[PDB]
Amino acid sequence: HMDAITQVPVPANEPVHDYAPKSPERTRLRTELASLADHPIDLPHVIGGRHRMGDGERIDVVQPHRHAARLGTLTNATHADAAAAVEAAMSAKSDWAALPFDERAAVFLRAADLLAGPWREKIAAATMLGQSKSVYQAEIDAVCELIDFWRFNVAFARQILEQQPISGPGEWNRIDYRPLDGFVYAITPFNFTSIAGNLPTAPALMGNTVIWKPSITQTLAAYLTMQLLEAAGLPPGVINLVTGDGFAVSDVALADPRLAGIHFTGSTATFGHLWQWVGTNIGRYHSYPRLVGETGGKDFVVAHASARPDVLRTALIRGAFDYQGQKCSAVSRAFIAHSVWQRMGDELLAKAAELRYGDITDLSNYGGALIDQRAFVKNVDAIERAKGAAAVTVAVGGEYDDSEGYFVRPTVLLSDDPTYFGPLLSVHVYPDERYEQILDVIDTGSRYALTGAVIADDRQAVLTALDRLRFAAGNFYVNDKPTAVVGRQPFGGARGSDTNDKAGSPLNLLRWTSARSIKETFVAATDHIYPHMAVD
Amino acid sequence: HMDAITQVPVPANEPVHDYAPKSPERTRLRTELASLADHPIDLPHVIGGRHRMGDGERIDVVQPHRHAARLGTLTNATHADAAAAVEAAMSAKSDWAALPFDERAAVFLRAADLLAGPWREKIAAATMLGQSKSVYQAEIDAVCELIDFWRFNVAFARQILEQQPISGPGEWNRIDYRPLDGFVYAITPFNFTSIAGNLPTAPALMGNTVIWKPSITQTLAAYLTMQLLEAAGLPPGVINLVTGDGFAVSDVALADPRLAGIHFTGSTATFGHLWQWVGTNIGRYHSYPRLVGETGGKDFVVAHASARPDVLRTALIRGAFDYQGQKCSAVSRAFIAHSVWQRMGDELLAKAAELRYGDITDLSNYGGALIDQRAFVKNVDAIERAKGAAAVTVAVGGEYDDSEGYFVRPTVLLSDDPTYFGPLLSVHVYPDERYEQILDVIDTGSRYALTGAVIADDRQAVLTALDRLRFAAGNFYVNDKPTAVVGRQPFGGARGSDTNDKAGSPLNLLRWTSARSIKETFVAATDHIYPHMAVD
Q: What CATH number does the domain containing A531 carry? A: 3.40.605.10
The CATH number of whichever domain residue A450 belongs to comes to: 3.40.309.10
A358 and A217 fall within a common domain: no
The Cα–Cα gap between A469 and A476 comes to 9
Chain B residue with Cα closest to A172: B488
B280 and B354 fall within a common domain: no
The Cα–Cα gap between B429 and B425 comes to 13
The Cα–Cα gap between A293 and A313 comes to 33
Instruction: Check whether B389 is labelled as a binding-site residue.
Output: yes
- Establish if B514 touches chain A: CB-CB under 8 angstroms: yes
B481 and B491 fall within a common domain: no
Q: What is the extent of the structural domain holding B365?
A: 296-485
Nearest to A378 by CA among A395, A358, A402: A402
Chain A residue with Cα closest to B465: A518
B306 and B285 fall within a common domain: no
A203 and A280 fall within a common domain: yes
- The answer to whether A294 is a known catalytic residue is yes
Query: Under DSSP, is residue A270 helix (H, G, I), strand (E, B) or coil?
Result: helix
Q: Which of residues 138-197 of A touch B (CB under 8 A)?
A: 165-168, 171, 173, 175-176, 178, 181
Q: Which of residues 211-270 of A touch B (CB under 8 A)?
A: none
Pair A493, A187: CB distance under 8 Å: no
Pairing assessment for the beta strands A298-303 and A331-337 based on DSSP bridges? parallel
DSSP structural state of residue A420:
-
Is the link from the previous residue into A536 a cis peptide, with omega within 30 of 0?
yes
Can you say whether the dihedral through the CA atoms of A77, A81, A83, A87 is positive or negative?
negative
Q: What is the dihedral of CA A452, A455, A461, A462, to 10 degrees?
A: 60
Distance from CA of B168 to the nearest CA of A (A): 8
Domains held by chain A: number: 2
**Where among B465, B485, B505 does a domain terminate?**
B485
Cβ within 8 Å, pair B478-A520: yes
* Resolution to 1 decimal place, in Å: 2.5
Of B489, B516, B520, which is closest to A492 when you measure between CB atoms? B516
The Cα–Cα gap between A68 and A122 comes to 22
Of A363, A475, A536, which is closest to B516 when you measure between CB atoms? A475
B462 and B531 fall within a common domain: no
Q: DSSP assignment of B247-285, as one string? A: HHHHHHHTT-TTEEEEEEEE-HHHHHHHHHHHHHTGGG-
The Cα–Cα gap between B218 and B190 comes to 5
Cβ within 8 Å, pair B520-A477: yes
The Cα–Cα gap between B499 and B293 comes to 7
Pair A78, A71: CB distance under 8 Å: no
Cβ within 8 Å, pair A528-B317: yes
Pair A355, B529: CB distance under 8 Å: no
A464 and A498 fall within a common domain: no
A323 and A465 fall within a common domain: yes
A437 and A520 fall within a common domain: no
- Establish if A491 touches chain B: CB-CB under 8 angstroms: yes
How many contacts (CB atoms, under 8 Å) link A and B?
A: 265
A189 and A250 fall within a common domain: yes
A117: left (phi over 0), alpha (psi -120 to 50) or beta: alpha
The CB density around residue A431, as the number of other CB atoms within 10 Å, is 12
A129 and A148 fall within a common domain: yes
Nearest to B396 by CA among B416, B373, B413, B408: B413
Q: Which amino acid is present at A494?
A: A
A155 and A234 fall within a common domain: yes
The Cα–Cα gap between B414 and B399 comes to 16
Q: Which residues contact B278 (CB under 8 A, 6 or more apart)?
A: B254, B259, B262, B285, B289, B291
The Cα–Cα gap between A123 and A130 comes to 11
